Amino acid sequence: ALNDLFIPETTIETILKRLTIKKNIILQGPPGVGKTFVARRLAYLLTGEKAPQRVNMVQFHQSYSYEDFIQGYRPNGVGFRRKDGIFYNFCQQAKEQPEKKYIFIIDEINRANLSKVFGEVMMLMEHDKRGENWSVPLTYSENDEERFYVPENVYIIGLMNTADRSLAVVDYALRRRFSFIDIEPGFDTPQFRNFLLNKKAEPSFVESLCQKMNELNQEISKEATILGKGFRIGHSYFCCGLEDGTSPDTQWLNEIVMTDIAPLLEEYFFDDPYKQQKWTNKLLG
């Protein structure tokens, strides 16, 4: 599962060192850098096997709750029945094969409230407080003796979107435990170019392509306090759309610019359309 990843090789190795120690990484970065993709592939590397079953992925939203995640009391035909969650179920699987590595991907973790979701278990999922010794009786547990312990094998990977203006302050609970890792857009990298080079794209189109977006990404980072670096546009759009075998050329590029980058600029730049017109022109002209 590591043949063509646009992210640099140094960082992806750093995450592996960071993950095997901390076990709780949050991947920042702009939308369209394949945060889910790298995390999904990284999960297979950590195991060393490209197997879906060990890995499970869920998307957090504001109304995501502990009842869905871990334990809840959904009704059967007549009366209420306790229902296993996702994580709880996931860990029961992890206990079977402690030697092997099981990995949980949590998309848009910043969006939800972690405490209401994780509940009691948030203390345990920190790498130190793991294993049988730190087992705690769960909130809905009818019998005190049954306990829940996060095994050491479990590693939690979180994807967080930097781009949003709405964000002001990250949750405290998240920062204490998880080690944030920043994913650069990686628009200008060897593997991304070589991926494009193998596809029917001439070298000039590459430098034209990298150069024009680079100035735009540079522009937003330049206005640092006004807008964060993380707003800067990613690369996933240019990856996608070429499955049909179409040659990538400026004729093809204009579709993505007008369809995908243009609304993104409109949302990002709500102040001056003239500024938007300047940057749209350069990409093609």
CB under 8 A: which stretch of 11-19, 30-38, 73-81, 172-180 binds another protein?
Answer: 73-81
Q: Is 35 annotated as a binding residue?
A: yes
Q: Is 10 annotated as a binding residue?
A: no
String marking each residue 140-169 x if it binds another protein according to CB under 8 A: x------------------------xx-x-
Residue type, 2: L
For another protein, the closer CB: 9 or 267: 267
Q: Is 241 in the site for ligand GDP (CB under 6 A)?
A: no
Nearby residues of 233 by Cβ (< 8 Å), 6 or more positions away: 30, 32, 185, 187, 213, 216, 217, 261, 264
Among a second copy, Mg ion, ligand GNP, none, the one that 63 touches (CB under a kind-dependent 5 to 8 A) is a second copy
11 contacts 183 by C-beta, under 8 angstroms: yes
Backbone angles phi, psi at 36, to 5 degrees: -65, -35
Chain residues 29-68 in contact with ligand GDP, contact rule CB under 6 A: 31-37
23 torsion bin: left (phi>0), alpha (psi -120 to 50), beta (else): left
Chain residues 109-138 in contact with ligand GNP, contact rule CB under 6 A: 128
Helix%, strand%, coil% for the chain, nearest 5: 45, 15, 45
**Using CB under 6 A, which of 8, 31, 151, 241 touches ligand GNP?**
31
CA distance 5 to 12: 9
Rounded to a whole number of angstroms, the minimum distance from the CB of residue 27 to ligand GNP is 8
31 exposed, middle or buried (CB, 10 Å; 0-12, 13-18, 19+)? middle
**Which positions touch another protein (CB under 8 A)?**
63, 65, 67, 72-75, 80, 140, 165-166, 168, 208, 211, 215, 218, 222, 225-226, 270-271, 274, 278
